[PDB]
């Protein structure tokens, strides 16, 4: 088990408030965030903000699947954004898929976290994305590739907090038993400790 | 869980916690900090800074300082805004926040029901706030506390208004900042800063106004000494 | 007022429904009432009524693998079941309630598309299962799944024989066969309160005040198909292991239900 | 006792008079609801026959009615609200409202700053005066001693208590704020 | 005009869903989990001035305008 | 939400400049903002940056049956789209009068010029033929969306490489990059758009204007003209009223500029092919500037996958087993059964009668 | 197929620089505030306009400096050989009506009707040849019928290029042949161009000659429509008195 | 195709068009009989007013939502008709259909002559009806049920609406039939549906088209439709009585 090549770039676009491109190996995702701004009166809520998430694919037009994977990202950002500090406003997170090579949802969650941090939004704790894909026998592989993903009988993806490493998001593909669900959860908890080190090292270097 | 007064000038991350000195104290947490129990929580990235003037009293506020573009109104800030409408007997002005502000026809110097001031749509105004809580649209008056407009009102006739990040504004508005003196050594200038991320400049020649506009946005970076003199010499031309 | 009132029953350990915080509502079903459909079943869960219907048609097999017959699920939430749904194109809740069922149908491998072909590469059966909710009280993804599984155990197809010189299809409407079903995926939903409280079989008001939701579906051999957690407070391995212990009993209950209703014919 | 359907012969115009939720035609009294038959004899004979369900799921507001509301947002010159209770009974849905800067006090006076009168999140008692325009639909009023904010809420989530006619104080932190206190 | 008797689908669609010891053990609530107020006067009984009433009765009685 | 309004000081400032023939960012009248191309890893994918605008182009092909009539060619979809992140204003269904003119500009240029050879994209006739489908996205709006979109589409189409097939007798077969090498396409010419803006009633013009210069302008003139000396489209629009010498001057300008742009594009594609053939490393990853603060590199890492067995084992072992109250099903009449607290009577009957 | 014989005659019998026959009419409808009807050659158009009125919807979509021109386009389902019915969502109608809105936001002297809308409707009953110029001329006539002031009399015509010569007022047979078509919208007094279009390839040396031939054919349309307007105004002046 | 649904096969021909069993023979009956009808009110719990109507092979469910925000001085009456895809010989497209809109309008022009909208200024009512199964006269069920729902939801109306249906035999001596079924409706030449107010004695809605061209048959079709609407009334009379007895006794 070994996480593959990682890369990230910040402040790409000049128009948004904060931009962040996060590519992990060959797959890549670009994201940008507009800060708290005005919101339509028909959608506004008092004592809280309103989150809007849109994802754009490369081939086709978004359908039921892409909005169903937009709900997970919105309900994940809803648990870490302090909306009570900014009522009667709107905060929107947009994720763009540039290239796909496997484990796209985890790289999208990491892109969203890095775009919100760069954009300067009050946060309670950072979050990460780890995807597991156990093979036809039970050999766990972390951060797999679409080559291994096609033959594998089950792929799981988890989102983990950055304080006590609890579970925030869980999307699973394939059928399995609980024992290897526990062992892939433990593998994800072990894997996030390096991603959080990449967050800390990137932000400590940024303010040098 | 580290302690304060030890991690000053250190980059912190959201979700981290820190221990203020022991005997609970009434020091108010700043923008990027929230007080929970007898501990402080971090909600913004940045660098811890502490300011107590001269004495062993309070004397002290905790606030992290970061780099961002989106502006949130703060009571007592000098903000440049642009008029948008003239509905009723007020002047809606766009400052850059979530909601537009609101002037009044009598807020200007010596303004009454007859000698109203001339304010068009799409003009920039220098003025200060008096209410900026998160319960209403912010409202700004535009002369003074006493009532004598000290350079306030409608400004800008032959200059350029551009936009920079909050970090450069914070850097320039410092008592130990030599940026303006050296930049004005090359090109004489006059500036009116705005805490919403706006700057008004006016050089002599249009070429100099272009150069000052481009070269001021890059002064947040490119640290002085080994770099600044050579950059100044190169741009002398 | 909102939170404290409910927590009065929570500390009392008897929620306003009159339940012990770890029990399900009353469940009843009927099968074989709509006579204009191949198969149908009505599921009642103490409100949260869902009805499903199956229609079989002919279609051309796909260009990649011409040995598969399509199955297409759809879940619709009309503006009459509740009062928050508005007319027009289907909304987010019904679309997610349909993508979830499509994912369950795919991962669970309940049916094999190779059992529906008549002659490879020209024509294959297609099943159109459409779900319409008659009442929205909470736990939608559980009763929709149970309605679908109950319906799929009643659909029966006629024996079709293709000629050689004529090459057309002659349907033998007298001898009608059945469908081959492999597994029986049953779902279970949990609602998590502010940071530690988990309840079973929630309600629309409770989901209105809850801070998260979890859904787990199990096979008949203790295998997990999907782990649907839309998000919220956060859980631990111990809490999931506590949930699956209840889900095992729920699955045994449901599998006994299906094993008993079909024998009664 | 017997119930009703929204049409049947009940009485003549001489043997009683129509009441609430009824109509008459051709000298007969006809039902217009499915409630219960109540005949209020009152005093003076000839009871005013009417039919009332007595289980109001919804009721349309009127020109004059007492309603319990809930503020949604406030502006420097008006304050949009949300009608929540029609007098006593709970309401299944929520309408919209607007409090102009003339209905705060019972004098229709100048000054009367809206900002410190109806802070968002409170629950108020108000009276309608009109059926309104398409911008503001019901035009509620609080120009009375019995109308105004009744149950406020603190800055940090604590049930408040009235302290004066114009001034309010926090019980926990002893903080001073301004409201429009209504008679209990 | 004879009315008829129901059938299965209708009699199941029209269902009304309305301590006895302890079961489902793990899902109880106990197993899964200074304030000196110095309160002011509790209400404010309005016994005092209430300006609107003042100004109204004031002017009506006064009735001088000088 | 909407876009920040335009003051009355910026208009004055741009117009005193333009009268004096000097612009904000230093470039003179007949200049472009320099360009920067970047190639993906799979074919038909590029990132172009004109000044500070970004467009992502990506080509992809697929095999369908060729309608009815035109039995010996292939079809070529296009779909421009404007991403909410390009600028605050762009909104999914509230900018429907720019999308149309943009899709049209793109389609008339690319499909009516006849530079792609859609003749030789057949396998059989009356049967499966390749249907290509170009796709562009706008990422960052800084003015001159169409020049960048056109250069992006050109490069993306001149970098694609199809699959490839064997056809002999009456039998098909489909290969893969390991069974057979992907094949390039055939491109007759390279039609490249140019835009001009007119200022204060045609008295001045400025080449390649950006978004502020776009809000102080009357109307726009676009002139698409492929290599050699052959014009392919023009579309005046906005608020302009034009002369006849000026169209010719513009045509000259577009000729010169397209010459230079084609130089650049050819050089960049050649260098990219040389890199791909030498055997070095390519892709979106090895493009991130390293002399810059916001880039970081980390080789692989086993984290420690030594403990997961033990933790999982103890967790499974340490929790309460399923309980053992089993429920009973009740039978009313074949077809309906109930489980739960149940109902008192067998069934309701004459409840109200 | 021959599109230009050696003698110089086209398919229908006219020379290179020869227009078709136009036959107009003013004042067709009564309920509306203006009307027109033109048949340029074998293409039958129609236009109806509605005068400055209150903005529909009142959704605060006004312009405090000028009026709001709103033009639509539709087409009958029997306008060509095949039925070819289309829904009211096609992008051809929107783009042609957007070029119509562009040219009439420049021809009309609109800074005289603050907070007002101008609704322009065009209906094509039979399309054979240039549809754009027939719609522009029919709506110029309908606007004149409505009394709306304008700077000049805008008129449009097309052209082409086959075998080294420039055509004029191309037809559908000639249009569907892959040639460098081109259209203008001219103001005769100043010679200014309100809109310019072209398609397919053409060398740069013949653009001046195609554009000149198109401008000349538009100036030739100008005189023919001018005599119609003068006869109409003299008709109404005779009627009045 | 559709970007808001699950995409399956592009085309799908149902097996009825390949059904090798030839169309059967309906039979004969007495045209002076009515299918027994059972009516229940107050079915749904989350709806302000609802009713479920079932008679023979017809299954229709109607629910009524209360007044909401937004001829004023009067309130609107929005309507929406939709039938279940699993009804009838073939499947139906979920997006909609011209037949559904025509029947929705034929409902709207029939339930407004009963309620008095001069009591709901600036408000509006929304009515939704669903047909679970089509086994006979349908428009004679979408009228009775949507009127029962209105009566149990406490809105003020002048009277109820009771519907019926008829069809014309295809023989050489055609005769109108009462309460036709699909076996007697797909083999018919014409059909008629009436909407009668039983007490006010006023026809609310009329619809009929077919091959009967003599203006002496339609007089009987209309007046036997009126006899049907006066014979279905007592069951709806006892249904609202039981509904109100139970709702009141539930307090």
Q: How far is CA F220 from CA F205, F223, G74, G97, G208, in A?
A: 10, 10, 28, 19, 20
- Enumerate chain B positions whose Cβ falls within 8 A of a Cβ in D: 88, 102, 135-137, 139
Which of D34, D92, D137 minimises the CB distance to H152?
A: D34
Asked if the Cβ–Cβ distance from F335 to C32 is below 8 Å, we say yes
F→G contacts (Cβ < 8 Å), by residue, are: 97, 100-101, 103-104, 108, 112-114, 225-226, 229-239, 241-244, 247-248, 251, 255
In order of B66, C64, D168, G140, the CA distances from D159 in angstroms are 37, 66, 13, 70
CATH code for the domain in which residue F164 is found: 3.30.230.70
Q: Exposed (0-12), middle (13-18) or buried (19+): which is E57, by Cβ within 10 Å?
A: exposed
* Separation between Cα atoms, residue C10 and residue C15, nearest integer Å: 6
Q: The tokens 């950055």 sit on which residue?
A: A162
- Pairing, β A18-24 against β A7-10: antiparallel
Q: What region does F203 belong to: left with phi over 0, alpha with psi -120 to 50, or beta?
A: alpha
Per the structure, the count of domains in chain H is 1
Q: Find the domain containing H217 and state its range.
A: 1-251
Nearest to C264 among F319, F326, F334 (CB): F334
Give the closest residue to A167 by CA, choosing from B43, C216, C237, C245.
Answer: C237
CB–CB of H163/H148 below 8 Å? no
On chain H, the residues whose CB falls within 8 A of the CB of D95 are 69
Name the token pair of A168. Answer: 């925030």
Best of A6, A24, A195 to disrupt the F interface by mutation (most F CBs within 10 Å)?
Answer: A6
Asked if the structure places residue F31 within a domain, the reply is yes
Resolution in A: 7.0
Residue C71, token pair as written in the block? 């199955």
Output phi, psi for G98, to 5 deg: -85, -35
Counting as contact any 3 or more CB pairs under 8 A, the partners of G are F
CA distances from D178 to B135, D6, D167, D170, E41 (A): 13, 51, 5, 11, 17
Structure tokens at H114: 């009963």
Looking at the complex, report in whole angstroms how far the Cα of residue G74 sits from the nearest Cα belonging to chain F: 17
Question: Hey, which bits of chain C come out as E strands?
Answer: 27-31, 39-44, 50-59, 71-76, 117-119, 123-133, 158-162, 169-176, 186-192, 198-200, 213-218, 224-231
Contact H74, H118 (CB under 8 A): yes
Please list the residues that pair with C76 across neighbouring strands. Answer: C132
A79 contacts in chain C (CB < 8 Å): 211-212, 231-234
Instruction: Please give the order of strands across the beta sheet that includes G202-203.
Output: F204-207, F195-199, F219-226, F230-237, G202-203
Distance from chain centroid for Cα C54:
13
Any CB–CB contact under 8 A between E35 and chain F?
Answer: no
Q: Does the beta-carbon distance from F312 to A186 stay under 8 Å?
A: yes
Distance CA D46, CA D26 (A): 19
Distance (Å) of CA G60 to CA A206, B90, E4: 46, 19, 60
How many CA atoms lie within 13 Å of A43's alpha carbon, on the beta-carbon side?
11
CA distance C227 to C217: 7
Cβ pair C245:F322 closer than 8 A: yes
Chain E contact probe: residue of F319, F335, F344 with most E CBs at under 10 A: F335
Instruction: Give dist(CA B125, CA B140) in Å, integer.
Output: 11
Which CA distances in Å does B172 have to A89, B175, B178, B212, B220?
A: 30, 9, 8, 14, 9
**Residue for token digits 């489908």?**
F133
| Yes or no, beta carbons of B46 and A207 under 8 Å apart | yes
Is F258 a member of any domain?
Answer: yes
* Token duo for residue C265: 């014919």
The answer to whether the beta carbons of residues H66 and H86 sit under 8 Å apart is no
Nearby residues of F171 by Cβ (< 8 Å), 6 or more positions away: none
> Do A25 and A4 contact (CB within 8 A), yes or no?
yes
Measure F6 CA to nearest chain A CA, in Å: 16
DSSP letter for each residue of chain G: --SS-SSS--SSS--TT----EEEEE---SSSS--EEEEETTEE--EEEEEEEPPSS-SS---SSS-EEEEEEEE-TTSSSS-----TT-HHHHHHHHHHHHHHHHHB--TT-TT-EEEEEEEESB--S-HHHHHHHHHHHHHHHHT--BSS--B--EEEEETTEEEES--HHHHTT----EE--EETTTTEES--EE-S-EEGGGHHHHHHHHHHHHHHHHHHHHHHHHHHHHHHHHH--
In chain F, which ranges are continuous DSSP H helix? 9-20, 99-112, 145-157, 211-215, 245-278, 308-317
CA–CA distance from E1 to each of A139, G170, H51, H182, H229 (Å)?
A: 73, 76, 20, 22, 11
Ranges of H-type helices in A59-177? 64-77, 104-119, 146-151
Q: Write the residues followed by a gap in chain E (C–N more than 2.5 A).
A: 18, 33
Considering CB atoms only, which of F319, F323, F342 is closest to C241?
Answer: F319
Alpha carbon separation from A105 to A3, A28, A161, H166 (Å, rounded):
15, 11, 16, 60
CATH number at residue H77: 3.30.230.70
The first and second tokens of residue D14, run together, are 């001489």
Total Cβ atoms within 10 A of residue B74: 13
Element (H, E) at A186: helix A178-206
Question: Beta-carbon neighbour count of residue F10 at 10 Å?
Answer: 17
DSSP helix/strand/coil, C208: helix
Sign, CA dihedral F250-F251-F256-F259, equals positive
With contact defined as beta carbons under 8 Å apart, do H164 and H138 qualify? no
Both tokens of residue F111? Answer: 């499909």
Q: In H, which residues are within 8 Å of E5 by CB distance?
A: 38
Domain carrying residue F62: 2-288
- Beta-bridge partner residues of F339: C27
Query: With an 8 Å Cβ cutoff, are D121 and A46 in contact?
Result: yes
Burial G210-226 (b: 16+ CB within 10 A, else e): bbebbbbbbebbbeebe
Q: Could you tell me if B45 and B66 are in contact, meaning their C-beta atoms sit under 8 angstroms apart?
A: yes
Is E13 in the F-facing interface, judged by CB distances under 8 Å? no
- E strand or H helix at C143: helix C140-152
Rounded to a whole number of angstroms, the distance from the CA of C149 to the nearest CA of chain F is: 15
The strand pairing partners of F237, in sequence order, are F220
Q: Is D137 on the interface with H (CB under 8 A)?
A: yes
C-beta of residue H3 within 8 angstroms of C-beta of residue A67: no
Residues β-bridged to residue B102 = B92, B139
Distance (Å) from the alpha carbon of F89 to chain H's nearest alpha carbon: 25
CB contact under 8 A, D120 and B135: yes
Structure tokens given for H241: 């009585």
Please tell me which chains touch A, using 3 or more CB pairs under 8 Å as the contact test.
B, C, D, F, H
Q: DSSP string spanning chain H?
A: --TTS----S--B-GGGG--S---------TT----BEEEE---SSSSEEEEEEETTEEEEEEEEEEEE---SS-EEEEEEEE-SSSSSS---TT--HHHHHHHHHHHHHHTTTB--TT-TTEEEEEEEEEEE-SS-STTTTTHHHHHHHHHTT--BSS--EE--EEE--SSS--EEES--HHHHTT-S-EEEEEEETTTTEEEEEEEESS---TTHHHHHHHHHHHHHHHSHHHHHHHHHHHHHHHHHT-
Q: What are the C-alpha distances in Å from H3 to residues A65, A94, F132, H8, H202?
A: 10, 20, 21, 12, 48
In this complex, do E12 and C134 lie within 8 Å of one another by their Cβ atoms? no
Contact call for residues F30 and F208 (beta carbons, < 8 A): no
In chain F, whose CA is at the least distance from the CA of B85? F5
Query: Using what technique was this structure determined?
Result: cryo-EM
| Calpha distance G19→F128 (Å, rounded) | 46
D75 touches chain A (CB under 8 A): no
Q: Which residue of A has its CA nearest to H3?
A: A63
Q: What is the CA radius of gyration of chain E?
A: 34
Structural tokens at position G212 = 């000149």
Give how many domains chain F has, as a whole number.
1
Distance between CA atoms of D162 and D184, rounded to whole angstroms? 10
């Amino acid at each position: 088990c070994s996480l593959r090549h990682f890369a990230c770039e910040q402040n790409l676009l000049s128009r948004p408030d904060g931009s962040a491109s996060f590519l992990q190996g060959d797959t890549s995702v670009l994201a940008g965030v507009y800060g708290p701004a005005e919101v339509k009166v028909s959608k506004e809520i008092f004592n809280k903000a309103t989150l809007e998430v849109i994802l754009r694919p490369k081939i086709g037009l978004p359908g039921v699947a892409e909005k169903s994977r937009e709900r997970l990202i919105r309900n994940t950002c809803e648990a870490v954004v302090l909306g009570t500090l900014h009522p009667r406003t709107s905060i929107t997170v947009v994720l763009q898929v540039v290239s796909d090579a496997g484990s796209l949802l985890a790289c999208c969650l990491n892109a969203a976290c890095m775009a919100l941090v760069d954009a300067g939004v009050p946060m309670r704790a950072l979050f990460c994305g780890v995807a597991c894909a156990l093979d036809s026998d039970g050999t766990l592989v972390l951060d797999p590739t679409s080559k291994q993903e096609k033959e594998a009988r089950a792929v799981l993806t988890f989102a983990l907090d950055s304080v006590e490493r609890k579970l925030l998001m869980s999307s699973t593909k394939g059928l399995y038993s609980d024992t290897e669900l526990q062992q892939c959860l433990a593998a994800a908890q072990a894997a996030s400790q390096h991603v959080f080190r990449f967050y800390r090292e990137s932000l400590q270097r940024r303010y040098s | 869980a580290r302690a304060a007064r030890t991690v000053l000038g250190q980059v912190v991350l959201p979700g981290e916690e820190l221990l203020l000195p022991e005997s609970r104290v009434r020091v108010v947490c700043g923008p990027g900090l929230r007080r929970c129990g007898d501990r402080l929580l971090v909600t913004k990235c940045g660098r811890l800074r502490h300011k107590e003037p001269g004495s062993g009293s309070g004397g002290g506020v905790y606030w992290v300082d970061s780099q961002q573009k989106r502006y949130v109104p703060v009571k007592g800030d000098h903000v440049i805004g642009i008029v948008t409408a003239k509905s009723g007997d007020i002047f809606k002005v766009d400052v850059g926040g979530s909601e537009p502000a609101s002037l009044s026809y009598l807020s200007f110097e010596g303004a009454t029901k007859r000698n109203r001031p001339n304010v068009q749509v799409g003009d920039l105004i220098y003025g200060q706030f008096v209410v900026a809580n998160k319960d209403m649209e912010p409202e700004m008056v535009c002369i003074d506390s006493c009532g004598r407009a000290n350079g306030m009102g409608v400004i800008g006739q032959d200059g350029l208004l551009f936009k920079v990040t909050l970090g450069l504004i914070r850097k320039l508005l410092a008592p130990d900042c030599e940026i303006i003196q050296e930049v004005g050594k090359l090109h004489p200038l006059e500036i009116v800063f705005g805490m919403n991320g706006r700057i008004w400049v006016k050089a002599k020649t249009i070429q100099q106004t272009l150069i000052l506009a481009n070269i001021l946005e890059a002064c947040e970076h490119m640290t002085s000494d080994q770099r600044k003199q050579i950059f100044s010499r190169l741009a002398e031309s | 007022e909102p939170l404290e009132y409910y927590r009065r029953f929570l500390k009392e350990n008897c929620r306003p429904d009159g339940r012990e915080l770890g029990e399900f509502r009353t469940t009843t079903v009927n099968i074989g009432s709509i006579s204009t459909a191949d198969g149908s079943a009505l599921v009642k869960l103490g409100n949260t009524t869902v009805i499903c219907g199956v229609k079989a048609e002919f279609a051309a097999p796909s260009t990649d693998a011409p040995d598969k017959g399509y199955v297409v699920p759809n879940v619709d939430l009309p503006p009459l079941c509740s009062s928050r749904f508005r007319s027009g194109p289907p909304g987010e809740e019904a679309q997610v309630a349909s993508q979830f069922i499509a994912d369950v149908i795919e991962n669970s491998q309940i049916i094999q598309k190779e059992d529906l072909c008549i002659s490879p590469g020209k024509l294959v059966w297609v099943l159109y299962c459409d779900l319409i909710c008659l009442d929205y009280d909470g736990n939608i993804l559980d009763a929709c799944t149970f309605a679908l599984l109950a319906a799929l155990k009643n659909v029966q197809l006629p024996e079709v024989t293709i000629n050689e010189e004529t090459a057309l299809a002659e349907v033998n409407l007298k001898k009608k066969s059945y469908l081959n079903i492999r597994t029986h995926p049953v779902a279970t939903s949990f609602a998590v309160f502010d940071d530690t409280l988990l309840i079973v079989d929630p309600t629309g008001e409770e989901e209105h005040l809850a801070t998260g939701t979890l859904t787990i579906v199990m096979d008949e051999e203790g295998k997990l198909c999907c782990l649907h957690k839309p998000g919220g407070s956060g859980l631990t391995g111990a809490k999931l292991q506590d949930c699956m212990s209840r889900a095992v009993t729920r699955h045994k209950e449901v599998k006994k239900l299906m094993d008993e209703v079909i024998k009664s014919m | 006792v017997r119930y009703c359907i929204p049409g049947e012969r009940l009485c003549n115009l001489e043997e009683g008079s129509p009441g609430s939720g009824t109509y008459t035609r051709h000298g007969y009294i006809f039902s217009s609801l499915a409630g219960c038959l109540m005949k209020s004899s009152e005093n003076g004979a000839l009871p005013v026959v009417s039919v009332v369900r007595e289980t109001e799921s919804q009721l349309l507001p009127d020109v004059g009615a007492i309603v319990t509301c809930k503020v949604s947002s406030i502006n420097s010159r008006f304050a949009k609200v949300h009608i929540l209770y029609v007098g006593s009974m709970p309401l299944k849905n929520s309408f919209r409202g607007t409090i102009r800067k003339e209905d705060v006090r019972a004098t229709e006076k100048d000054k009367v700053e809206i900002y410190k009168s109806f802070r968002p999140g409170d629950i108020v008692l108000a009276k309608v005066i009109s059926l309104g325009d398409a911008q503001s639909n019901y035009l509620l009023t609080t120009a009375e001693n019995e109308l105004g904010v009744v149950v406020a809420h603190s800055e940090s989530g604590i049930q408040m208590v009235p302290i004066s006619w114009c001034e309010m104080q926090c019980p926990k932190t002893h903080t001073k704020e301004f409201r429009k206190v209504a008679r209990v | 005009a004879l009315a008829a008797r129901p059938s299965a689908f209708a009699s199941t669609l029209c269902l009304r869903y309305p301590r006895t010891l302890d079961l489902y053990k793990t899902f109880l609530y106990s197993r899964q989990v200074e304030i000196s107020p110095l309160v002011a006067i509790t209400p404010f009984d309005f016994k005092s001035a209430s300006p609107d009433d003042i100004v109204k009765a004031n002017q009506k009685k006064a009735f001088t305008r000088e | 939400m909407k876009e920040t309004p335009l003051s009355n000081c910026e208009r004055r400032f741009l117009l005193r400049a333009i009268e004096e023939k000097k612009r904000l960012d230093g470039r003179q009248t007949y200049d472009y903002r320099n360009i920067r191309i970047s190639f993906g890893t799979d074919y038909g994918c590029c990132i172009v940056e004109l000044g500070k605008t970004r467009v992502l182009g990506q080509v992809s092909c697929e095999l369908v049956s060729p309608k009815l009539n035109r039995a010996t060619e292939g079809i070529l979809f296009f779909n421009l789209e404007l991403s909410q992140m390009a600028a605050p204003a762009f909104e999914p269904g509230r900018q429907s009068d720019l999308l149309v003119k943009l899709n049209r500009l793109m389609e008339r240029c690319l499909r009516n010029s006849k530079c792609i050879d859609t003749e030789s994209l057949c396998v059989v006739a009356g049967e499966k033929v390749w249907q290509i489908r170009v796709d562009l996205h706008l990422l960052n709006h800084d003015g001159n969306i169409i020049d960048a979109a056109s250069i992006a589409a050109i490069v993306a189409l001149c970098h694609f490489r199809r699959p490839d097939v064997s056809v002999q007798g009456d039998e098909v077969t489909l290969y893969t990059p390991e069974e057979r090498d992907p094949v390039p396409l055939s491109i007759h010419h390279m039609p490249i758009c140019v835009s001009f803006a007119f200022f204060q009633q045609g008295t001045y013009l400025l080449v390649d204007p950006n978004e502020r210069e776009e809000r102080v302008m009357d109307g726009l003139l676009v002139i698409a003209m492929n290599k050699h000396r052959e014009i392919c489209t023009i579309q005046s629009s906005g608020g302009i009223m034009l002369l006849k010498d000026q169209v010719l001057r513009c045509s000259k300008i577009a000729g010169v500029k397209v010459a230079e742009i084609t130089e650049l594009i050819l050089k960049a594609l050649e260098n990219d092919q040389k890199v791909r053939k030498e055997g070095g490393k390519f892709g979106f990853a090895e493009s991130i500037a390293n002399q810059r603060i916001t880039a970081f590199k980390m080789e692989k890492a086993p984290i420690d996958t030594s403990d997961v067995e033990e933790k999982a084992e103890e967790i499974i072992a340490e929790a309460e087993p399923p309980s053992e109250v089993v429920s009973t099903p009740v039978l009313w009449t074949p077809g309906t059964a109930q489980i739960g607290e149940g109902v008192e009577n067998s069934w309701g009957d004459l409840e109200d009668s | 197929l021959e599109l230009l014989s050696d003698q110089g005659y086209r398919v229908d019998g006219r020379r290179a620089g020869e227009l078709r026959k136009i036959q107009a009419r003013m004042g067709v409808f009564a309920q509306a505030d203006g009307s027109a009807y033109i048949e340029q050659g074998n293409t039958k158009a129609l236009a109806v306009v509605y005068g400055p009125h209150e903005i529909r919807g009142s959704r605060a979509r006004a312009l405090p400096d000028r009026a709001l021109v709103n033009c639509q386009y539709s087409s009958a389902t029997f306008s060509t050989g095949e039925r070819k019915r289309r829904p009211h969502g096609d992008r051809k109608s929107c783009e042609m009506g957007l070029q119509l809105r562009q040219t009439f936001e420049a021809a009309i002297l609109t800074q005289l009707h603050p907070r007002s809308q101008i609704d322009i409707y065009v209906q094509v009953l039979q399309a054979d040849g240039g549809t754009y110029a027939a719609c522009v001329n029919a709506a110029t006539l309908a606007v004149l019928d409505a009394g709306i002031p304008m700077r000049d009399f805008v008129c449009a015509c097309s052209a082409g290029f086959v075998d080294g010569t420039a055509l004029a007022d191309l037809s559908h047979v000639e249009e569907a042949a892959g040639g460098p078509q081109l259209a203008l919208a001219l103001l005769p007094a100043s010679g200014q161009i309100a809109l310019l279009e072209m398609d397919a390839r053409l060398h740069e040396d013949h653009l001046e000659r195609v554009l000149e031939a198109a401008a000349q054919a538009a100036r030739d349309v100008h005189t023919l429509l001018d005599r119609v307007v003068r006869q109409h105004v003299r008709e109404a002046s005779i009627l009045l008195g | 195709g559709d970007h808001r649904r699950i995409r399956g096969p592009e085309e799908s021909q149902p097996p009825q068009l390949y059904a090798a069993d030839e169309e059967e023979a309906p039979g004969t009956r007495d045209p002076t009989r009515l299918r027994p009808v059972y009516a229940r009110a107050g079915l749904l719990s989350q709806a302000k007013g609802s009713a479920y109507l079932e008679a023979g092979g017809t299954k229709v469910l109607c629910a009524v939502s209360g007044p909401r925000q937004a001829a004023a001085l009067r309130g609107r009456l929005l309507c929406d008709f939709r039938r279940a895809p699993f009804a009838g010989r073939r499947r139906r497209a979920p997006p909609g259909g011209c037949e559904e809109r025509e029947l929705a309008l034929a409902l709207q022009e029939a339930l407004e002559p009963a309620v008095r909208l001069g009591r709901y200024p600036r408000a509006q009512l929304e009515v939704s009806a669903l047909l679970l199964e089509d086994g006979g006269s349908a428009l004679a069920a979408a009228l009775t049920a949507a009127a029962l729902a209105l009566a149990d939801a406490g809105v003020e109306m002048y009277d109820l609406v009771v519907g019926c249906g008829l069809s014309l035999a295809p023989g050489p001596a055609p005769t109108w039939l009462l309460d036709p079924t699909r076996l007697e409706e797909e083999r018919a030449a014409a059909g008629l549906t009436v909407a009668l107010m039983p007490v006010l004695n006023q026809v609310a809605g009329l619809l009929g088209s077919g091959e009967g061209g003599l203006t002496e048959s339609w007089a009987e079709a209309v007046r036997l439709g009126l006899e049907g609407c006066q014979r279905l009334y007592p069951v709806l009379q006892q249904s609202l009585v039981r509904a109100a007895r139970r709702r009141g006794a539930a307090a």
